[PDB]
């Protein structure tokens, strides 16, 4: 259905410029943020694949203001198997 | 019959792109549609093996994701990539020329003249044709496009005298090497006009 | 399309020469074929798009009217123009031949021997068929022109077996080098006869 | 046309030896396929000029008609030869997709991978397709042999992905050098399941 | 059971690329997740041998041009024991 | 009655290759096979002599591969106390 | 039915070590084992043709540190005559 | 099940010192021997894998005075297809 796009952030304050970043430049949705211990949390946007994209060339010139991105990446189609088994906020 | 017309009912979201490959192989030709339609939702249109042995690919959909799936497709393809073609909007007079190789069989009173333009390959046709669409108010005719023909592929604008030398401008730059000849007859005989093809 | 027939009707004038152009670019094909209906009002048969890129322009008239525009037609060709003919009466068996591709089905009872020929290009294929029937009492079969085989083009003749030699070696004479691979069979097989391309 | 079936009727004898002959010449077609059938009493199945302009030849009946049918070819061919193939036993699937280019629109439900192979002759396509059905149970769904895509030759095998694996190892295997490229797609997008040349 | 593919990533975006790569690369069944603490997660496929040994081969493609590949390794027919003691979602 | 054809192998596993391709390359009816102890098998096909001149020359070119051939033979027409006391299948 | 996987050992200790090796290393059936006399032993598994693909591979490297292998070598589709005659696990 | 040692020699007399020495040298079950012809004969004990991992290189050294040992193994834990399907001792 809608795409996807995830930023990977070493702290919790540069998501959250990122995330804040992001839905005020395009129209994405925040649809919650991932946890994975050590450091790195993963703020995720979902939007058609003209939304995510140009989001987070906003993103992640914000997130490297206030600190490390690990990995910015856009994927314009999540599959079904994904999209149902990842906490990705679109599984039915 | 019914996913070329150049707009959509209101149930429908409108697909202006257009990602158009022309490979010299088709086994990788059809890995490449593959991976572009796993990279982006592209409406594809067709996906056809033409003359000289080459594979035919055209897709519509909106602008990021024919361009998503263009990226996609210009990867898997990197060799046995012959032309590409990504057209952000794509003429209302080009949609129902594609498919169906359609000759024209008469044309109007107060047309005058006609120029004729054949490429090598599809894509520089088909880019040059919206190209000079776009900049000139001509009627396209007909169009070949590498059916029976062995690769090369042609098409045929009308109109006043003036347009159509303009159309001229733009299409012997717009094309490049990919040109072969490009007629602009200013007044073609009575027994001639709308049957050009026959 | 009752322009294919070899005797006109009677409310029409006779038109018994053949004028054939082989074209390499398409553009300039439907120019040369612009310019020699422009220069002297040849009837014009045909104007197609075969394959390997070629086109074929067939014109008709009386022999002083398709020569001159033939004329005129090897001044603007040139320097694209790949083969010429100028046939000042084309033989009555030819006409119903050179629209679509007849393939024999069935054959007459003592038809003693058969024999394939093919040129390189139409134009060698038409002028070697046409001085063959003119000097041997031979009939012909089938006949393709370069539609779907790539610029090739065959025929068959039939008849009796020093006929068929004699016709053969005025093929052989007519054409020179354009002549691909001529083949003789003195007794086709009773397998075979009639039921030649299937 | 029925002769181009699997099994032969009640009243028939069983034909399952096959001969495939590719020729760089229509003249020599007619004359390597009259001479066979004058060597061996061999059903001639086609004899049929096709694109590049190549000729293409297939012949059916009992394992020594076919091979002395074929010996008597190949003795008499050269010097225009193509290419040769005399398989003993053709798989049952095979017989179906040799009269036209018969693509396929619906693949099954749990119809996992796709193989999509071209070869730049005919005779290793119909070796390929027939030495990887024998191997793997697969199921070929289309195929085309040399018709519109000047000479070259496809086909698409599906099945479970291990299996169209060791069809791949197989046809790399019998091809070698005939080989044009290959494709082994894992699982297509839903929008390519059948639904896949059009 | 049935055979066993997994990537270990340093980084949860990594994984979902990764996961995407292996759900469309081949036919398998993304069962979850596996987190370690660290940044380090791992996406779990299974299936029969001959998916998983392509599709984990085709994640591993598709995970060094994001994050940073631990481990890609695929384990034909694991004991009933490991499937019994590990979370690996094929607990009888 | 139909024809005789054989393959004598050292090893199982060349006889049952050299059975296959038998089988496969032509049309022939596999009949059965015979252990003569010491690790001799020879399998036997019996069908038209045409077929099965055409099944052991690509059944001596496969077995060859995997093993080693003692012996190919083909018999056009064996007579009927051949069938009647050797066992070929085609007993009485 | 399945594709076939075949080792054959000059014993049987070689054989008992490759079929556990085959039997481990996939998902594979052990329909069981063939004498031809003379030691030539034949250790015969079944199952999918990536699956015997990976376990006569396995089986062999696991089993010429012991004694001689006389052929392994996988059947990808056996023909149905060669079930139904030579005694392979899967005759109806 | 429970491991498993065997003892392939050319020669009975060998095989009767190997299943001596295994069974006294250590506490297995000696469940007996398979023939295969030509005089290869396996003795087949089944124990804990710390007593047949001893027996079975205290057998080998003390019947490679009478015989040429052909082979020597240990499995530590047959798999339950080797077991239920080739002869060695404990068939369900």
């Avoid at chain 1, 490297?64 to 079904?80: C, L, M, N, Q, T």
């Avoid at chain 2, 990539?81 to 209302?92: F, K, N, Q, V, W």
């Avoid at chain 2, 046709?125 to 496009?145: E, N, Q």
Wanted: glycine share 8%.
């Amino acid at each position: 259905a809608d795409a996807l796009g995830m930023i990977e952030v070493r702290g919790f304050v540069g998501m959250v410029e990122a995330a804040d970043a992001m839905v005020k430049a395009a129209k994405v949705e925040l649809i919650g943020y991932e946890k994975t211990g050590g450091g790195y949390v993963t703020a995720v946007v979902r939007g058609d694949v003209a939304a995510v994209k140009a989001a987070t060339e906003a993103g992640q010139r914000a997130a490297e203001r206030v600190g490390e991105v690990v990995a910015v990446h856009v994927i314009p189609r999540p599959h079904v198997n994904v999209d149902a088994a990842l906490p990705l906020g679109r599984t039915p | 019959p019914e996913r070329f017309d150049a707009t959509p009912p209101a149930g429908e979201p409108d697909r202006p792109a257009l990602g158009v490959l022309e490979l010299t192989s088709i086994a990788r030709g059809i890995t490449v549609a593959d991976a572009a339609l796993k990279r982006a939702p592209s409406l594809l249109l067709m996906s056809r093996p033409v003359s000289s042995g080459k594979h035919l690919l055209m897709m519509r959909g909106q602008v990021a994701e024919v361009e998503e799936s263009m990226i996609a497709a210009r990867e898997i393809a990197g060799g046995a990539l012959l032309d590409e073609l990504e057209l952000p909007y794509a003429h209302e007079q080009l949609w129902r020329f594609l498919d169906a190789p359609v000759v024209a069989d008469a044309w109007e009173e107060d047309t005058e003249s006609v120029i004729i333009v054949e490429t090598a390959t599809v894509c520089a046709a088909i880019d040059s044709a919206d190209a000079a669409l776009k900049t000139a108010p001509v009627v396209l005719r007909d169009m070949r496009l590498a059916i029976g023909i062995a690769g090369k592929a042609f098409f045929t604008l009308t109109g006043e005298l003036a347009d159509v030398e303009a159309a001229a401008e733009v299409v012997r730059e717009r094309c490049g090497a990919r040109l072969l000849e490009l007629a602009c007859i200013a007044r073609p005989v009575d027994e001639l006009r709308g049957r050009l093809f026959f």
